[PDB]
Amino acid sequence: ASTKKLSESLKRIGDELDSNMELQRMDSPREVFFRVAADMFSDGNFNWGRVVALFYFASKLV
Amino acid sequence: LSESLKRIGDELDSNMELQRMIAADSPREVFFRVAADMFSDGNFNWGRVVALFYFASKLVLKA
Amino acid sequence: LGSDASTKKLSESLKRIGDELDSNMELQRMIAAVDTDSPREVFFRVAADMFSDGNFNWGRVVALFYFASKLVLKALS
Amino acid sequence: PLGSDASTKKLSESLKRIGDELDSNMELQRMIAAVDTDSPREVFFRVAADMFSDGNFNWGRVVALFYFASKLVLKALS
Amino acid sequence: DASTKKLSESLKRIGDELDSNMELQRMIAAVDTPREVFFRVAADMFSDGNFNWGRVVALFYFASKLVLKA
Amino acid sequence: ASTKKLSESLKRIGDELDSNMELQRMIAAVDTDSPREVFFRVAADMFSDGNFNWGRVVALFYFASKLVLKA
Numbered sequence: 469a470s471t472k473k474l475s476e477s478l479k480r481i482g483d484e485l486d487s488n489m490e491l492q493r494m495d496s497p498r499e500v501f502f503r504v505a506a507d508m509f510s511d512g513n514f515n516w517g518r519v520v521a522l523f524y525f526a527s528k529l530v
Numbered sequence: 531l532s533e534s535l536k537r538i539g540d541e542l543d544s545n546m547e548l549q550r551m552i553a554a555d556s557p558r559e560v561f562f563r564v565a566a567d568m569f570s571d572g573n574f575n576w577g578r579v580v581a582l583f584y585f586a587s588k589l590v591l592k593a
Numbered sequence: 594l595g596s597d598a599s600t601k602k603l604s605e606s607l608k609r610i611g612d613e614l615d616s617n618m619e620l621q622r623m624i625a626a627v628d629t630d631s632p633r634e635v636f637f638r639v640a641a642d643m644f645s646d647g648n649f650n651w652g653r654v655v656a657l658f659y660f661a662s663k664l665v666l667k668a669l670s
Numbered sequence: 671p672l673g674s675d676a677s678t679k680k681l682s683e684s685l686k687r688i689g690d691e692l693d694s695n696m697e698l699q700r701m702i703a704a705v706d707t708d709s710p711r712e713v714f715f716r717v718a719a720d721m722f723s724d725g726n727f728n729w730g731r732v733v734a735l736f737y738f739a740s741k742l743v744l745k746a747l748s
Numbered sequence: 749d750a751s752t753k754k755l756s757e758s759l760k761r762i763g764d765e766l767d768s769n770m771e772l773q774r775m776i777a778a779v780d781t782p783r784e785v786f787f788r789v790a791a792d793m794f795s796d797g798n799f800n801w802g803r804v805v806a807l808f809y810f811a812s813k814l815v816l817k818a
Numbered sequence: 819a820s821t822k823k824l825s826e827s828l829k830r831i832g833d834e835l836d837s838n839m840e841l842q843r844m845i846a847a848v849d850t851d852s853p854r855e856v857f858f859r860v861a862a863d864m865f866s867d868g869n870f871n872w873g874r875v876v877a878l879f880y881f882a883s884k885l886v887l888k889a
């Protein structure tokens with residue numbers, strides 16, 4: 469029950485990110501990444517979850 | 531999109547139950563058990579992969 | 594441009610290991626036969642089996658990395 | 671529900687056998703343990719330079735060099 | 749084989765100029781114990797909107813020395 | 819603030835790298851049909867002396883990464 473309560477949480481978070489935001493929204497890879505990254509951190513909040521979402525976004529374009 | 535990656539990472543950062551469940555040893559064995567239970571069904575959507583990476587990246591900071 | 598008894602012997606063994614990986618015909622056939630349907634399920638099935646016995650050593654990580662990188666290239670074309 | 675996948679099992683069983691030969695090759699681990707614990711960047715370069723001295727840059731060699739690199743980073747870490 | 753000599757000699761001087769820049773080494777060493785000063789420098793590096801690749805490598809040079817101290 | 823001086827030095831270094839026309843000229847003159855062999859021959863020549871300082875690895879990463887864009 470220990471690992472099961474944690475995996476169902478991440479599984480619940482993962483599917484709700486996949487169904488809420490119409491993702492897979494995707495000319496020049498480097499520019500547009502730094503374009504959204506500058507807009508992600510216009511407010512000086514560099515929280516860790518923002519880097520993780522920005523990490524996957526960078527690997528998507530490659 | 532810029533606000534999409536923002537609120538996605540923010541709500542994942544603010545889930546008090548998730549941050550409490552992550553705080554609950556031997557990191558690699560639990561990560562393998564968590565990853566095996568996450569994809570016990572047959573869907574490997576990006577959100578689960580990101581949430582597993584977010585769990586792994588948080589799991590390596592404690593070690 | 595420089596060697597030693599130990600480093601030269603170490604280099605030839607790593608070179609022999611890497612060459613036997615790429616020339617293992619049966620290994621290359623199994624890798625080339627993976628489905629382009631979902632390489633994620635294949636990668637998960639492989640990783641789950643490689644760490645099912647509760648044992649984790651870096652040779653298996655390295656072998657999983659060799660397959661994952663080849664799986665990425667085949668799924669690109 | 672993930673059921674069976676016999677062809678993937680043949681592959682994962684082979685990769686698992688390959689990774690265990692690397693970890694249990696006592697001749698390889700002896701050579702890895704017996705390289706200078708002083709300048710790990712230097713010995714890594716000389717190994718890499720000799721591995722690709724012949725014009726062959728196949729991916730299996732890169733992975734074998736990455737394996738030696740990964741073990742090299744751990745020895746200098748402990 | 750000689751065309752390599754000029755290029756490798758320039759990259760060699762670039763790397764040595766980086767590590768032997770005493771003012772730069774002092775500034776990198778004067779940081780505090782973590783991941784947030786990296787973003788403070790990063791957002792300060794790209795505030796003019798220029799994301800040319802040389803700046804990313806220069807930031808990688810700082811981050812790698814920053815992560816070694818950790 | 820305190821990081822302002824360091825941020826301007828890294829930004830200056832990055833701008834000097836990309837604007838070094840003689841360096842960009844040499845990187846652009848690399849054989850596109852064998853970028854791997856050119857890289858190894860440059861890397862072996864860079865460390866032909868006994869020095870393996872981290873700055874040289876970063877410079878090698880700059881040349882290698884620019885090599886991957888053309889490839």
Ligand SMILES: CCCCCCCCCCCC
Pocket residue numbers: 710711714739742743746
């Ligand atoms: C004491 C020097 C730091 C230890 C680094 C060892 C890593 C060697 C492998 C290099 C791979 C790029």
Ligand SMILES: O=P(O)(O)OC[C@@H](O)CO
Pocket residue numbers: 615727728729730
């Ligand atoms: O020759 P292989 O082993 O396929 O690797 C080549 C790859 O590194 C780029 O083409």
Ligand SMILES: CCCCCCCCC
Pocket residue numbers: 561562563565566569574579633634636637640641644
């Ligand atoms: C112990 C199995 C870990 C496998 C990671 C799951 C990633 C699949 C996309």
Ligand SMILES: CCCCCCCC
Pocket residue numbers: 735736739740741743
């Ligand atoms: C050849 C890969 C060098 C990176 C070493 C990483 C060690 C874990």
